[PDB]
């Protein structure tokens with residue numbers, strides 16, 4: 001086989017010329033030359049079968065990415081597994097090679113308002129599709145957004161995606177957790193298991209702010225610190241927002257806090273397009289019910305020059321196990337690439 005860093009990467013013969021790109025996932029990601037398509041591709045190696053949770057995230061993701069077909073969602077071009085379940089140690093997900101991601105890009109570049117508008121548009125275009133299939137991404141963040149050399153954007157990492165379940169959304173104060181802290185909607189830390197689409201919009205809202213300033217807008221250092229960050233900018237929620245929080249621990253935590261007034265975005269972002277600040281405003285709304293939805297976000301004037309519903313597709317149809325059957329389902333699900 002071939003070896004990258006110091007580890008076996010068994011993707012011959014079609015995929016050659018393996019350069020190390022990074023970690024994440026259940027480990028290694030590499031560029032490789034796809035001999036059949038004569039193009040370099042990304043290959044991530046997964047060894048998930050040791051604990052159930054990785055078999056779950058790997059399964060969720062493969063199931064979803066196979067069903068999705070969208071310019072702004074990453075997709076899977078190939079999967080390399082052993083020919084028998086007994087011999088299957090690893091799964092190799094083959095995907096398109098992308099120059100960078102929004103995380104790296106933000107660390108080094110000032111984005112123009114045109115790149116911001118186009119990036120945002122693409123995010124929302126992709127998100128519209130995902131939501132229309134009734135799936136939530138639940139972990140949108142700049143590192144989960146990949147750009148190619150031509151600034152084409154693709155959402156990746158559906159490891160934590162769930163099917164939307166707004167009826168089953170409620171939970172107690174501080175019940176936690178799992179999605180990246182900085183991009184978590186405030187109701188995750190109060191009264192939501194994050195089963196509503198409004199959860200993603202918040203994230204996109206946080207991504208938009210990060211694009212305006214190259215800094216995360218709510219860099220809370222720990223669980224509850226996140227909330228005072230958010231509250232610090234948006235201000236104390238009103239009477240009506242509070243009433244929507246029936247859970248007493250959460251509501252009384254909010255009441256115990258000192259009054260903070262709203263900081264206007266134009267003060268936080270003096271150079272930004274005012275249309276962007278308006279949309280920003282509607283996305284980072286404390287009350288998730290009052291929070292804008294993806295299709296109104298698309299129709300917002302800030303996006304006017306890209307907005308075209310006939311070129312913004314929706315899915316043609318919508319959407320607790322031992323790691324044994326999981327390994328077995330993964331095998332069954334990866335069969336079509338044998």
Ligand SMILES: N#Cc1c[nH]c2ncccc12
Pocket residue numbers: 021029042044095096097098099100146156
């Ligand atoms: N995971 C994953 C990736 C899928 N495509 C990629 N391109 C550059 C870097 C990482 C990837």
